[PDB]
Structure 1
Amino acid sequence: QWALEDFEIGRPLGKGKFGNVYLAREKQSKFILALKVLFKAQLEKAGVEHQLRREVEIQSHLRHPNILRLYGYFHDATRVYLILEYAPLGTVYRELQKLSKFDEQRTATYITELANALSYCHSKRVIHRDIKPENLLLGSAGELKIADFGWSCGTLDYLPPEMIEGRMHDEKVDLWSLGVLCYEFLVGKPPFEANTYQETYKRISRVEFTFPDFVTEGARDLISRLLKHNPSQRPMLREVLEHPWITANSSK
């Protein structure tokens, strides 16, 4: 229903691996949106042609203030194009490099907007992975918005134990990500970082992490409760919005 000639591309937002994302205005009536171009190259270098083709199928059937929108897509002879919502204030990874580490007010609010988005995703029967600071955009008001979802290998940093052990995984995976994220926001780095898979794999498998002095109790109690090896004993996100440290610092 769309084509490359209903759009006017502007400032290059990001130059990535599978393509580029540009600021674009729908010339029909001047709508500001993010337009990502995925070439057949790289994409056809892997079998991800229909791998991230069902990912777009999941994206469209997804409406949420904290979930980045997918308006549509179309195919070229060289590439494919994705019409996405524009997030004025970049990624959380960028804000994280400038501030190095977040406080408790900001972090508690981020895991709140995330718990809501994940809850909606589970109610809509959607399992998510990959969720990391590189995949989180800020809106006009700093509204957190999750992206990618093409994954709905690489750096294991944000993968749960059951997933790397090649075993079974369910909805409780997103509550491990919530734990790893909350740590990274508070500390500045993921709780299982390293220089290799074999080390990170061991560390993530053994669930071996430590706390800097400044990260406080209530935050420790939440990161700890969230980062249990077994898929159970991890609170359902309904219970994570309830946590005292969360509520005592969050926004709504």
Structure 2
Amino acid sequence: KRQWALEDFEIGRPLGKGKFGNVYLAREKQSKFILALKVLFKAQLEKVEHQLRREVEIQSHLRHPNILRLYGYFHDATRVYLILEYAPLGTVYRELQKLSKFDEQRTATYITELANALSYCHSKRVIHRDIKPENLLLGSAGELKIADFGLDYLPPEMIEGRMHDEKVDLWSLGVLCYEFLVGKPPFEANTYQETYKRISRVEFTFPDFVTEGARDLISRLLKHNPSQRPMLREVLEHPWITANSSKPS
């Protein structure tokens, strides 16, 4: 067990706001490494608690270069502090907004890193990650980090009130692959009710610039019947992925 204290850190700029408190860039005073210090107000946190609890637990046991690291935690009487990895390149969402859409190389690379992280997650029994672009951070090398962390992306089984399994993550990967290449998720519409229908019927169109290999991959992942979706290893072996990914799996 390691005891941390506020005094061990040099607090820097705020990196953002969570529904429960702020996140700051911070430097640990001895090592000088740089990290994110997330603050959660004990009070409104019971407005629940002991979950997050599950959360620090889960994130603490996950050790992967494509999953945001939790280095430790400490607390006082209105605050709990999470010592988190700092992702210097920001969010993938920011990158998508700036470029409007990603090329095949960038997309296939991100999908490789995500499939690897998801495969590791599943190997540790963790499933159903929210991998929307705003929840994906970028490390120093431009490598993606799943930053889960205590409707467009919901699979049919979910919106149709059935039970779901790890196959929900494959559906997410397909929606993500489409959003990366196109700049918007595939079932986007005006009203939630119209989006629910699109998802339920797997109703979406491809822009002309989406290639043959990309369509094959996306269409397989976005199968209504979860058992018909490819396994993560089949995604990593898909020819469109092995042609375009700038990194091995």
Which region of structure 1 is more displaced relative to structure 2, 205-214 or 194-203?
194-203
Q: Residues 67 and 147 of structure 1 are in contact (CA less than 8 Å); yes or no, is this contact kept in structure 2?
A: yes
Give deviations 1:141-167, integer Å, cap 9, x for gaps: 1111110232xxxxxx11111122222
CA–CA separation in structure 2 for the residues paired with 1:132 and 1:98: 16
Q: Residues 70 and 84 of structure 2 are in contact (CA less than 8 Å); yes or no, is this contact kept in structure 1?
A: yes
Aligned to 1:210: 205
Distance of aligned partners of 1:98 and 1:40 in 2 relative to their CA distance in 1, 3 Å threshold = same
Shift of 1:41: 4.8
CA–CA separation in structure 1 for the residues paired with 2:43 and 2:154: 27
Shift of 1:52: 2.0
CA–CA separation in structure 1 for the residues paired with 2:190 and 2:75: 39
Shift of 1:237: 0.5
CA–CA separation in structure 2 for the residues paired with 1:148 and 1:124: 15
Which region of structure 1 is more displaced relative to structure 2, 119-128 or 9-18?
9-18
Shift of 1:68: 0.9
Instruction: Provide runs of 4+ in structure 1 moved above 3 Å.
Output: none
Aligned to 2:28: 26
Give aligned pairs, total. 244
Shift of 1:128: 2.7
CA–CA separation in structure 1 for the residues paired with 2:190 and 2:78: 36
CA–CA separation in structure 1 for the residues paired with 2:156 and 2:129: 13
Shift of 1:193: 1.4
CA–CA separation in structure 1 for the residues paired with 2:190 and 2:83: 36
TM-score normalised by L of structure 2:
0.93
Distance of aligned partners of 1:50 and 1:200 in 2 relative to their CA distance in 1, 3 Å threshold = farther
Runs of 5+ consecutive residues of structure 2 not aligned to the other structure: none
CA–CA separation in structure 2 for the residues paired with 1:75 and 1:208: 48
Runs of 5+ consecutive residues of structure 1 not aligned to the other structure: 151-156
Q: Residues 178 and 226 of structure 1 are in contact (CA less than 8 Å); yes or no, is this contact kept in structure 2?
A: yes
Distance of aligned partners of 1:76 and 1:167 in 2 relative to their CA distance in 1, 3 Å threshold = farther
Q: Residues 129 and 148 of structure 2 are in contact (CA less than 8 Å); yes or no, is this contact kept in structure 1?
A: no
Shift of 1:29: 2.6
Give deviations 1:134-193, integer Å, cap 9, x for gaps: 11111111111110232xxxxxx1111112222211111110010000000000011111
CA–CA separation in structure 2 for the residues paired with 1:31 and 1:163: 41
CA–CA separation in structure 1 for the residues paired with 2:44 and 2:122: 31
TM-score normalised by L of structure 1:
0.92
Shift of 1:201: 1.8
Aligned to 1:96: 96
Which region of structure 1 is more displaced relative to structure 2, 159-168 or 118-127?
159-168
CA–CA separation in structure 2 for the residues paired with 1:239 and 1:68: 25
Shift of 1:77: 2.0
Q: Answer yes or no: is 1:49 the counterpart of 2:49.
A: yes
Q: Residues 156 and 224 of structure 2 are in contact (CA less than 8 Å); yes or no, is this contact kept in structure 1?
A: yes
SS of equivalent to 2:244: coil
CA–CA separation in structure 2 for the residues paired with 1:221 and 1:66: 25
